[PDB]
């Protein structure tokens with residue numbers, strides 16, 4: 001997509017070399033924002049082939065409150081295997097925080113149902129937020145939240161969403177995170193009877209790993225094809241009730257895949 | 265500052281009218297980013313004279329872990345008087361979450377000491393964060409955190425910081441929020457023997473209240489002056505021992521005040 005490949009050239013052009021937690025080395029910039037208007041088409045990158053099956057099942061797993069990869073295995077998705085323990089547990093990462101944030105007085109807050117309630121009854125609230133950054137449980141998480149905090153907004157009967165992502169692997173992770181949140185905005189919008197508006201991505205540390213530079217210059221030499229269209233075939237009775245089969249991605253003709261290694 | 269007045273103009277040209285919780289009326293946009301290169305000077309606005317006594321005592325009251333308006337009255341700072349209860353308490357707002365985030369098992373995390381030890385021992389970490397958005401205590405706060413989440417970054421011996429502001433009153437709160445976080449980077453960079461880098465500001469619902477249109481038009485025809493420079497007179501023994509008389513602002517020549525009403 002035009003915004004994605006321009007972000008990639010910017011980290012190459014203004015990036016600082018940094019060492020990091022995995023010992024791989026990155027080129028990174030700090031602070032960036034881009035906007036995708038979802039009425040122009042589904043934001044799935046076309047300059048390399050992305051695996052829709054993984055993007056959709058991880059969202060569904062998140063909306064169930066799950067943090068164990070058994071579900072993802074039943075559906076042949078392996079994106080989270082290198083961080084799970086001997087039992088498949090990842091710790092209280094995204095699903096648990098979204099659906100059951102633990103309070104100090106022994107309650108648990110379902111943040112997704114709260115947001116859905118706000119979008120219906122008080123869409124002009126400036127408090128429609130989901131946070132996965134729970135300071136008191138960070139030490140029990142296998143990997144700290146990269147997509148940390150997001151906010152909804154309603155304006156001319158269109159729902160928008162802005163995400164703050166504190167760490168971003170541009171090549172491997174960011175095509176998955178842009179398509180995931182785009183899908184969530186369409187699902188929230190269908191449940192609230194709102195039109196889809198913009199997805200705003202904001203980044204903290206936006207980096208390219210040193211073992212991903214050939215892949216990056218390869219991809220960057222390719223022209224974006226027309227953006228795909230998403231068809232949802234059913235309106236379920238709640239957001240927690242969607243199935244993989246309700247989603248059709250139409251018109252996706254991407255350039256070939258580019259394999260790259262994940263830094264653990 | 266140029267960045268500030270262009271955002272003010274963008275809100276008038278592009279904002280949607282919204283009825284807000286105050287009932288005052290707002291013109292809003294959603295999603296904006298501005299960066300200030302702190303090497304170019306202290307970003308205190310000059311198109312209206314800003315009150316620095318309030319900005320610095322409020323930030324020292326926050327790093328003390330205080331939520332009681334008593335300390336601010338002792339220093340004649342009036343900004344938080346109308347959300348405070350009969351005893352002067354605001355609930356566990358900013359200072360309580362920065363210095364003593366309550367965990368579900370009765371412990372407390374001091375996020376400001378964690379950030380100090382992270383910047384001194386692991387400057388490359390992509391996780392140097394403090395969050396005020398404690399979902400388990402939101403209903404106990406007098407007003408929900410507007411400046412909600414921030415992150416620090418170190419690249420070539422320089423300290424940067426990005427704020428996510430989820431709700432922004434452009435005429436009244438935003439001048440104050442920018443200089444507060446600028447000041448904080450200076451104090452953090454001095455205690456960590458780092459140079460200062462950028463302050464990146466990202467906003468969620470960014471707005472201009474209805475009863476501020478005249479004051480905005482009056483501010484929008486003034487020319488920004490050269491930015492001042494911030495002098496810190498002594499190096500305290502910790503980030504917790506700074507005092508009002510420790511800071512100096514040289515070269516600040518603002519346009520007159522501009523008085524305006526706050527929506528409660």
Ligand SMILES: *c1cc(=O)[nH]c(=O)n1[C@H]1C[C@H](O)[C@@H](COP(=O)(O)O)O1
Pocket residue numbers: 021143144145146147167168169170173174177390391
């Ligand atoms: C986290 C998972 C996700 O959804 N998206 C991502 O981009 N990643 C990343 C970012 C970074 O490259 C790494 C996480 O490491 P760290 O905690 O930031 O040190 O995977």
Ligand SMILES: *c1cc(=O)[nH]c(=O)n1[C@H]1C[C@H](O)[C@@H](COP(=O)(O)O)O1
Pocket residue numbers: 126127285407408409410411431432433434437438441
């Ligand atoms: C919050 C306090 C601060 O530091 N900065 C701000 O701009 N504000 C604001 C924004 C908004 O006008 C109001 C908060 O109201 P709400 O919670 O967003 O509904 O004060």
